[PDB]
């Protein structure tokens with residue numbers, strides 16, 4: 001995946017939490033928000049690098065998906081588990097995707113209905129960090145199929161339920177073939193995050209822009225400024241989905257497209273850059289937990305050190321406390337790519 | 338232009354209005370609504386077939402434009418068409434490029450040059466023997482996040498502005514939605530349903546068919562399988578920004594639209610495109626005319642009976658008017674019995 005960089009950081013952070021006896025902190029949830037069809041599920045699964053989320057035309061995501069990535073230590077290499085099926089273990093990622101669709105139909109029906117009941121999915125991997133990603137239905141305007149008159153408000157409040165959590169990062173997704181000032185994602189992000197401390201803007205579908213136009217002004221922050229960044233991506237077309245085009249090919253073609261059409265900005269756009277940018281934000285959040293961790297170490301070390309003049313297990317736990325203080329310093333000094 | 342069919346009917350109406358001394362039947366105003374950039378100004382000017390509206394990327398329409406088409410008689414004729422703005426008093430505009438520029442100029446004066454929006458309309462009349470008497474209203478597009486000079490409540494200011502025009506019961510709403518967006522996200526159809534819940538005066542226009550993602554098309558949308566729209570769902574293809582930059586003509590735009598529909602939507606091609614949008618509007622306008630003939634007829638009788646009384650049951654004026662009103666009555670029946678090709 002393009003988000004493996006934090007693995008060694010979280011591994012040593014775990015070591016500290018194990019030593020100090022505390023429960024490890026939770027990274028913020030990464031939540032995708034935007035108008036229906038803006039490319040949300042495509043963006044979110046690109047952080048995983050495995051195809052597991054239903055994507056397509058019209059209304060697709062019809063329940064929240066709480067996708068918990070769970071790091072697997074030494075204790076198929078990758079596998080999935082849904083809460084609703086209890087213990088069934090999925091090694092086939094196409095089957096995982098199909099089960100999301102199955103579960104969605106079971107609760108939301110087979111005629112465009114939307115339910116707030118979340119689907120809980122765990123993906124176990126040695127190549128993922130402990131991180132929760134949240135896929136959501138897109139905002140809409142006119143009820144279709146089974147949807148009630150107030151479907152727009154039902155969806156919007158569903159989204160707010162997730163992004164009003166102060167420990168969430170918002171991926172505000174807007175299609176490039178729409179005017180940025182019409183971004184429903186950015187409007188709603190600014191309601192819960194008025195100062196842009198936890199909103200990252202993603203501009204999808206660069207490849208679908210009208211001839212004679214481009215997203216240069218948008219991507220240079222000259223339309224709507226967004227503090228944490230505005231990152232352009234090119235995910236698979238419906239034709240590509242139908243033809244089962246791989247992630248590898250999608251990424252290669254995305255890179256080529258940016259080099260061809262956005263050469264001056266290409267190194268600050270694309271899916272790999274999105275992943276790196278999210279890593280930096282997650283690291284920022286990690287560094288804010290460290291003072292809390294620090295004070296804990298200092299109290300327990302003074303507690304073990306008063307126990308002096310049994311004698312080995314307190315002596316080497318004092319050694320393990322010392323190691324934890326240095327690990328904290330290392331985390332603070334760690335550079336990511 | 339594609340909306341000349343009603344000319345003979347409105348000439349007949351004018352003969353009656355001239356006799357009756359008032360323009361008793363007013364056609365509904367045609368008002369374009371939709372999200373910013375949905376292609377509204379492009380659709381509206383296509384009903385004129387002359388390139389007078391500013392069109393482009395980003396925010397373009399920033400004041401209402403009340404565009405009054407005024408049919409001109411042969412006696413008032415004379416290279417055959419011109420424009421006048423209320424704000425430039427009696428200045429006559431002969432060049433339609435200059436008319437487009439003046440809309441931009443007058444927008445900049447009141448709305449500024451950093452994306453601001455004003456509700457104050459620009460009033461423009463276009464005089465021509467090739468147009469009917471018809472008011473078209475261009476409006477700013479709906480938005481979400483303030484930019485430039487725009488205030489924090491820009492979205493509501495624009496939505497409320499649109500509502501003021503489309504809440505007029507004597508208006509046909511062109512609800513414009515870009516084809517490269519999901520129909521269920523149509524701000525145009527949402528707002529239209531607030532003033533026209535029953536769909537009696539809302540026509541859905543689906544623009545930018547040419548921009549749809551590979552592996553997708555608007556067949557379901559155009560067949561009414563997504564959101565049904567009683568009066569119709571009509572797909573169009575107007576000029577791209579590259580086309581605007583390359584000065585592509587209206588003639589070529591329409592030919593390419595026709596070709597596109599033939600290639601991509603062959604089964605539906607004859608019920609889509611710009612000419613079909615015009616023909617659909619013509620039918621709606623003719624239905625309003627037919628609805629109002631009893632009023633017009635009654636009004637003739639009010640005058641006829643009156644001049645007959647002044648005719649002892651001045652005299653010469655009464656006699657001429659009675660004959661003119663007799664003619665007017667005959668014209669009414671002809672209009673009623675006219676069916677469009």
Ligand SMILES: Nc1nc2c(ncn2[C@@H]2O[C@H](COP(=O)(O)OP(=O)(O)CP(=O)(O)O)[C@@H](O)[C@H]2O)c(=O)[nH]1
Pocket residue numbers: 035036037038039040041042043054055056057058059060061062136137138139204205206207208233234235236237238239241550551
């Ligand atoms: N050409 C192109 N198509 C894209 C891109 N990203 C997504 N798509 C296409 O857009 C459609 C929507 O993709 P998806 O990721 O399912 O969007 P979504 O916003 O999750 C849909 P919902 O709002 O219902 O959940 C699909 O047909 C997909 O192939 C892109 O960058 N370029």
Ligand SMILES: Nc1nc2c(ncn2[C@@H]2O[C@H](COP(=O)(O)OP(=O)(O)CP(=O)(O)O)[C@@H](O)[C@H]2O)c(=O)[nH]1
Pocket residue numbers: 210211372373374375376377378379380391392393394395396397398399476477478479544545546547548573574575576577578579581
């Ligand atoms: N490819 C393509 N481009 C179109 C079509 N219709 C309009 N455009 C393009 O979309 C952009 C917006 O067109 P315009 O007619 O100004 O839309 P508008 O909705 O009036 C813009 P505003 O909301 O600010 O008034 C222009 O760049 C124009 O070339 C279409 O059918 N196909």
Ligand SMILES: [Ca+2]
Pocket residue numbers: none
């Ligand atoms: Ca006659």
Ligand SMILES: [Mg+2]
Pocket residue numbers: 040041042054055060061135136137
């Ligand atoms: Mg989705």
Ligand SMILES: [Mg+2]
Pocket residue numbers: 377378379391392397398475476477
């Ligand atoms: Mg416009």
